[PDB]
Symmetry: C3
Subunit: 295 residues, 3 copies
């Protein structure tokens, strides 16, 4: 795209603030940002806030979101679809033109781990170029295993294709499949979808801890066979809904856009790979590490 | 196939009638019928009754089906496999020769949303050419949420490949992936698997309604990540069995041949896309619309 | 690989023995073995014990495994990752060099149907070449339907690609997709992953029996849509955990590495195909048969 040549917009922080007991304001940007998706490989991503996947949003069950999108793309319209909410797609998930803002309001009444993404036609193009992320809605009554969990992280799976190549997007295998982590608490890593960061800087934990992962596979096109090497999932809540309880799963099947909360114990010091067990995708980048130490 | 050149058999209505409290007669045809699968693209489908997917069949739990297949194909044998039933495949799902009929009898003792399809070797060929559909078996005791539902429809996902090209069927990506709807009550739309009909003539509903969809992904080859934009599934019954209850799912993973009953609320007027969230498939046709109005 | 040219190591039996109430010894080999994966097609597989998938291992919930791997490959290191166990991957699933042995110890505390496989980098290469199998961990308290089951078998799904071709493994469609069966009791068949054996020598059962299948899809890359033609699954336990109960499923979605226990009734004499309902994979070999007779 001629108007994107040489464009590399610096990442802008997510803006969020609570404005009442059941209402939150969220402002994001749509922006064009170079990301290093594999060593030596730059992708001029279409992004929320200069991150791909986008920034983590966390709200409470029953929160109404007042969402603003500031579109910094010089020439392409963008939009926002939160899977967490009940909304009219054709009134609430509409396009925001270049250099304009749009504000939209909708309720998040269901707990879980939801995908969000740009909803601009062709949606495959906006997603595949980088406009995806997760919103967590925390359950009013928690999860039944909350008292058991010692540490938590968020992981997101996505794919990368040939740059802005709609033929590749529709008909081709992914070039890369990757994990990222997004921060829940100060000090947590916050990364983009790449083949290397979570290998080189593993997630950290302590021997004997029960770990919770909020996970979502944003696609755009592949399903995920989510597995942590060296353990078994004690508890799995599908889409992060506390009712959809499974126990003792070795691997969790996630559809494209599918989420889960998964919990497992690390019993011994060492490094634990986290994979999709579709090993073609793992080989093309979708392996993260969890380093477990005596401290 | 030389004997199919210029053949376009008019659709024949499904024949069904109840012959006792727990017994139903169903007659279908196998027939060769031109279908417009995308704008300007005709596929000379192998079909049940001149529809692809085939006509909707609905029975009650505990019904014995007395099924007749009249084979109008001039040269290819066909057969019928209902996933709803307990039968001997090698006695009950056998071939019916060109210009002959065969009658078969078997019980449907499990509630759900089942695939049916031709069972003639090579089964991939008969399925991919169009010989697929759904049979719904209604549960004796209903679903626990029956009192909440205001409107219902049936949706079916299937793929189309290069015409009668076994190499493509086994090794290639789908050319099109599509939704159809089949009628449950008078006035409901009844359509074939194409890229456009349910965009141009959306399914209809009223603001505030709880909608039930009976869904099945007949394949032949792809899994489905079933999602309705702008809502969250309140309740999901996997394969349509009332026992397999999930709640608050953003997206439902269906295997090839997999079914579900899903329920959701539309809270605001507008148009709600219904997609598989494998966006390569959505881009190749698998987007339907639900138009929700104040009336 | 020059050092594998002309190498065809005879299969070696699995060695297992119980050494206390909650401790078992298992010795396996890593070895290079020609397998006939389709008629006329030999694959010089990388294997455990000269079988691909490898030998069946069955333990009890709460058993500690003392596992020995003797590496007979003249030049490639191998390792073992059991999904059943809690272990440190970086201490317990490490490489055993050519012509050496390694011993590792870890607990199997969760019941189910687990994948095992070589964990040597690149893991896709070791898996795709044949280093996969299943370990069953029997639940302390059984399954709730145990009293209903008349006969049981184990089935495993895997794929084959172009020989040792990492490009094909990562980016290409499978050449073959296949079932095998592994023996639970004397007289049960024990086969390798091929396109023909379980067609030519079907699994056997008696009219009216409730059949249990322990199943796992080891991949490396595909998901499975597991279906038995002519019946409906009465009960499904996901990953073989008794808590993850589903009922009346026509087809079970298995991720790559995913397992299940499934139970169904065969009501009439005949031959019942067992398929993945991704029919491209079925056409490329993934059809087994169950022959059901009056005796
Ligand atoms: Cu309040
Ligand atoms: Cu506000
Ligand atoms: Cu966009
Ligand atoms: Cu979406
Ligand atoms: Cu703890
Ligand atoms: Cu009666
Ligand atoms: Cu009759
Ligand atoms: Cu046919
Ligand atoms: Cu079938
Ligand atoms: Cu209502
Ligand atoms: Cu004891
Ligand atoms: Cu020992
Ligand atoms: Cu190996
Ligand atoms: Cu593994
Ligand atoms: Cu019995």
């Amino acid at each position: 795209i001629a108007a994107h040549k040489g464009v590399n917009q610096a990442p802008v922080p997510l803006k969020m603030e609570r404005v009442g007991p059941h209402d939150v304001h969220i402002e994001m940007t749509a922006q064009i940002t170079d990301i290093e998706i594999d060593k030596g490989k730059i992708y001029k991503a279409w992004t929320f806030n200069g991150q791909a996947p986008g920034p983590l949003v966390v709200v409470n069950e029953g929160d109404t979101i007042h969402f603003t999108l500031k579109n910094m793309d010089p020439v392409v319209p963008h939009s926002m679809d939160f899977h967490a909410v009940h909304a009219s797609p054709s009134k609430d998930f509409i396009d925001v033109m270049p250099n304009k803002s749009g504000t939209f309001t909708y309720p998040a009444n269901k707990p879980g781990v939801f995908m969000y993404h740009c909803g601009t036609k062709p949606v495959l193009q906006h997603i595949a170029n980088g406009m995806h992320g997760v919103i967590i809605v925390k359950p009013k009554n928690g999860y039944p295993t909350d008292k058991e969990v010692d540490r938590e992280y968020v992981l997101i799976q996505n794919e990368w294709y040939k740059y802005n190549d709609m033929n590749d997007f529709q008909n081709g295998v992914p070039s890369y499949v990757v994990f990222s982590s997004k921060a829940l608490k100060p000090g947590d890593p916050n990364t983009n979808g790449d083949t290397f960061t979570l290998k080189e800087k593993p997630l950290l934990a302590k021997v004997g801890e029960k770990i919770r992962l909020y996970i979502n596979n944003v696609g755009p096109n592949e399903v995920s066979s989510f597995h942590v090497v060296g353990t078994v999932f004690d508890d799995v809540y599908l889409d992060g809904n506390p009712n959809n309880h499974l126990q003792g799963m070795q691997t969790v099947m996630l559809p494209a856009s599918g989420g889960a909360v998964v919990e497992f114990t690390v019993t011994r010091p060492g490094t634990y790979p986290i994979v999709t067990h579709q090993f073609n995708h793992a080989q093309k980048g979708a392996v993260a590490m969890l380093k477990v130490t005596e401290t």
